Structures are given as structure tokens and as C-alpha cells.
Design a protein around this ligand. Structure first.
Ligand code: CU
Ligand code: CU
Ligand code: NA
Ligand code: NA
Ligand code: NI
Length: 309
């Protein structure tokens, strides 16, 4: 329920506090609606996000996403966001899915936020489902409770985002692959969770670490299944000289015109969010790959990447 008089900040101890990021009592008028809101961090100095607790209605909320960024798309109370979340790069921290219960951060692991370089804002995206549980006209305050601490964490959580930019899916085309690859050139990262994201043309999304020619599965998922962060089968380290490679399999069947990458439901996306940790003294919070630097390498991609899970 809504917090009313106590507000969104709960003190836990001298150095920690819970921040509740909730909808300002909204009432979705249509189904399949996407709401956004923002919260400036209460603290200017560096803090660590070490836990998330969902505060979702168990009937109306389909999924929730939380981001860190410096400039949310809109100011004010709330806005409608078909994942038009931030104006700068939105750094995903958390996904909650109705049908896919989230996995916790490992102990000792946190995202760095605030300070000179970290996110100054959280942006909450809530996707509402069938909205039949709104005939009472009630106000919804679904969201997330975030556990922040100033105690520096020995391990820092980050995001390696792989995304297609140039994909064109001609109408009626049975199979279109969107391939993404980059050489990794940082200190070692350990992947512990992944999220896949396409729109309605996506069949299967797979991500791999390629080392000396060998393909090691990070994650492989049907993007039409709930788009939560799923744990990695085996914590995969990615080290200097490694190549990260991803493939989204698309279809143009059902479409009368070409589908390219874009920000609407009728466009497509090929996103693979690889959540990792790094040693605190080596850590960087975000890396991005929007390229295909080793296209011929995909000829030895495992067969599982081409058949839907
Ligand atoms: Cu949803
Ligand atoms: Cu999208
Ligand atoms: Na979008
Ligand atoms: Na191939
Ligand atoms: Ni390791």
C-alpha cells in the first residue's frame, strides 16, 4: 500500500536506509500500460545498493524495471513510458516479473550510485496487465524498496549490455539473425545473472563467452517468456582478450513491412543484459556492445542458438 505520512526513507542503522520507490497513486485507464516515475537520491555522496524488495500488487502488475540514470525522460509526478525511460543511458538495476521470481544479489555485491560518477536518479518503470482489479477505482502504489548503504562493498555489480542497432527484418522472412560481438578489454568480470529483451518477433536470445574459439553459454532464453534476470547456470568469468557474442533470432512472419530496431512496440530490439560483479578496486559499473567485430566467428556458434527454447 501507499506510504502516506512516513514518506519513502526508512532509517535502518547509522550508515544504511531503505528507499521506497512507488507510483504516486496511479490508476491505469487502459490495459498493457507502462508507467514511469523518478526519485532523486536523498544522498549526494557515494552509496551502494545491496538489496531490492518488490512492493507489487499481485494481480495488476505484469513487470517492473528499476534504472539508475542522471536525466530521466520526464520531470514531475509520473509519465507514460514504452521504455522511453531516461534521456541519458538508463542503467538497469533490477527486474521483477510476475511469473518469474527474482534472484537476490550475492552477499558482498552492490551497485555504486550517487557521488561524482554514479546515478543521481532511480527510474521506476511499471507495466500494468489486465487492469480488471481497478473497477474499485483504487490508487496503485506498486514499486520497489531499495537497500542503500555507505559501507563500501568488496564486490561491485555492473551491467554488460549487448544490443543490435542495424537489424532489418524484411516482411515474411523466416529467419533473421541479429549478431553482436565485442572484445573484452577490462579486468575480469563474473556473470551471475542475465536478462533477454526483444519485442514480438523474437524467438530465442543467446549470449556466449568466446575464448580461444570455445563457446561458453552465459544465457539462452525465449524472449516471449517473462523477461526477468535469470541466474547463470555457472558463474562465467570474462577476462581480457575474450570475445562476447550474442544472437537474437527473429522472424518477419506476420508483418507486411520491414521491421528495424527502434523504440516502439512495432519496432524490434535485440538486448542482452549481462549482470556481473567485479572486485571493487578493479570495477566499472557499465559496459556496452553495439557492434559485430567478429562476424565470421558466428559460423561456429552452437546449434542451440538457432533453435527456440
Ligand atoms: Cu510486463
Ligand atoms: Cu524494447
Ligand atoms: Na521501447
Ligand atoms: Na551461423
Ligand atoms: Ni572465477
Amino acid at each position: 500500500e501507499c506510504l502516506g505520512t512516513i514518506g519513502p526513507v526508512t532509517p535502518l542503522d547509522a550508515s544504511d536506509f531503505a528507499l521506497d520507490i512507488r507510483m504516486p497513486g496511479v490508476t491505469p485507464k487502459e490495459s498493457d500500460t507502462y508507467f514511469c516515475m523518478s526519485m532523486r537520491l536523498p544522498v549526494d555522496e557515494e552509496a551502494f545498493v545491496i538489496d531490492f524488495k518488490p512492493r507489487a500488487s499481485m494481480d495488476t502488475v505484469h513487470h517492473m524495471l528499476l534504472f539508475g540514470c542522471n536525466m530521466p525522460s520526464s520531470t514531475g509526478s509520473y509519465w507514460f513510458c514504452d521504455e522511453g525511460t531516461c534521456t541519458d543511458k538508463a542503467n538497469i538495476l533490477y527486474a521483477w516479473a510476475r511469473n518469474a521470481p527474482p534472484t537476490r544479489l550475492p552477499k558482498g555485491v552492490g551497485f555504486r550510485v550517487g557521488g561524482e560518477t554514479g546515478s543521481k536518479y532511480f527510474v521506476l518503470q511499471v507495466h500494468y496487465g489486465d487492469i480488471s482489479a481497478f473497477r474499485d477505482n483504487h490508487k496503485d502504489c506498486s514499486g520497489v524498496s531499495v537497500h542503500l548503504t555507505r559501507v563500501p562493498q568488496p564486490l561491485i555489480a555492473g551491467m554488460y549490455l549487448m544490443m543490435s542497432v542495424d537489424t532489418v527484418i524484411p516482411p515474411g522472412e523466416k529467419v533473421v539473425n541479429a549478431d553482436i560481438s565485442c572484445q573484452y578489454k577490462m579486468y575480469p568480470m563474473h556473470v551471475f545473472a542475465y536478462r533477454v529483451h526483444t519485442h514480438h518477433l523474437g524467438k530465442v536470445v543467446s549470449g556466449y563467452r568466446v575464448r580461444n574459439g570455445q563457446w561458453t553459454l552465459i544465457g539462452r532464453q525465449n524472449p516471449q517468456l517473462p523477461q526477468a534476470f535469470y541466474p547463470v547456470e555457472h558463474p562465467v568469468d570474462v577476462t581480457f582478450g575474450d570475445i562476447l557474442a550474442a544472437r537474437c533470432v527473429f522472424t518477419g512472419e506476420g508483418r507486411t513491412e520491414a521491421t528495424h530496431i527502434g523504440g516502439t512496440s512495432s519496432d524490434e530490439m535485440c538486448n542482452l543484459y549481462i549482470m556481473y560483479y567485479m572486485e571493487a578496486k578493479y570495477a566499472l559499473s557499465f559496459m556496452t556492445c553495439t557492434k559485430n567485430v567478429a562476424p565470421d566467428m558466428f559460423r561456429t556458434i552452437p546449434a542451440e542458438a538457432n533453435i527456440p527454447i
